Amino acid sequence: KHQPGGGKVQIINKKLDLSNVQSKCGSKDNIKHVPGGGSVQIVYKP
């Protein structure tokens, strides 16, 4: 919606973006894509 930088202008990326749900730079719990510094768990950057 606003992720494109303005509802009036759409970069189509909106579909990729969750939108307001995204809030944080990533999804909930950092998309749990933790590569290492994120929390060192999966340690396999998705």
Short mmCIF file of C-alpha atoms in Angstrom, two decimals:
data_model
loop_
_atom_site.label_atom_id
_atom_site.label_comp_id
_atom_site.label_asym_id
_atom_site.label_seq_id
_atom_site.Cartn_x
_atom_site.Cartn_y
_atom_site.Cartn_z
CA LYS A 1 0.00 0.00 0.00
CA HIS A 2 2.35 2.70 1.26
CA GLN A 3 5.45 0.53 1.02
CA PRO A 4 5.92 1.75 -2.60
CA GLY A 5 6.57 5.15 -1.02
CA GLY A 6 3.10 6.46 -1.86
CA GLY A 7 -0.28 4.85 -2.45
CA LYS A 8 -0.61 7.03 -5.54
CA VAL A 9 2.55 5.41 -6.94
CA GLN A 10 2.94 1.63 -6.97
CA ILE A 11 6.20 -0.24 -7.53
CA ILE A 12 4.33 -3.55 -7.64
CA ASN A 13 6.70 -4.57 -4.85
CA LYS A 14 3.67 -4.04 -2.62
CA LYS A 15 2.56 -7.55 -3.49
CA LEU A 16 5.90 -8.79 -2.20
CA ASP A 17 5.52 -6.60 0.88
CA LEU A 18 3.11 -7.69 3.61
CA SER A 19 2.23 -4.01 3.97
CA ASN A 20 1.44 -2.58 7.39
CA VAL A 21 1.98 -6.05 8.82
CA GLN A 22 5.60 -5.76 7.74
CA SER A 23 6.03 -2.84 10.15
CA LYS A 24 9.60 -3.84 11.03
CA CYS A 25 12.22 -4.08 8.29
CA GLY A 26 11.26 -7.75 8.16
CA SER A 27 8.38 -9.99 9.19
CA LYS A 28 7.72 -11.11 12.76
CA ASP A 29 10.82 -12.27 14.62
CA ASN A 30 13.04 -10.96 11.83
CA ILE A 31 11.42 -13.36 9.37
CA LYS A 32 13.32 -15.85 11.52
CA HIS A 33 15.78 -15.75 8.64
CA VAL A 34 18.51 -15.13 11.22
CA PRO A 35 21.81 -15.51 9.28
CA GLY A 36 23.90 -15.17 12.42
CA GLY A 37 24.08 -11.81 14.17
CA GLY A 38 20.29 -11.91 13.94
CA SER A 39 20.33 -14.47 16.75
CA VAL A 40 22.49 -17.33 15.47
CA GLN A 41 19.94 -20.13 15.18
CA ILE A 42 19.18 -21.31 11.67
CA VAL A 43 22.54 -19.87 10.68
CA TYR A 44 21.55 -20.40 7.02
CA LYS A 45 20.34 -17.04 5.67
CA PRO A 46 17.16 -17.88 3.69
#
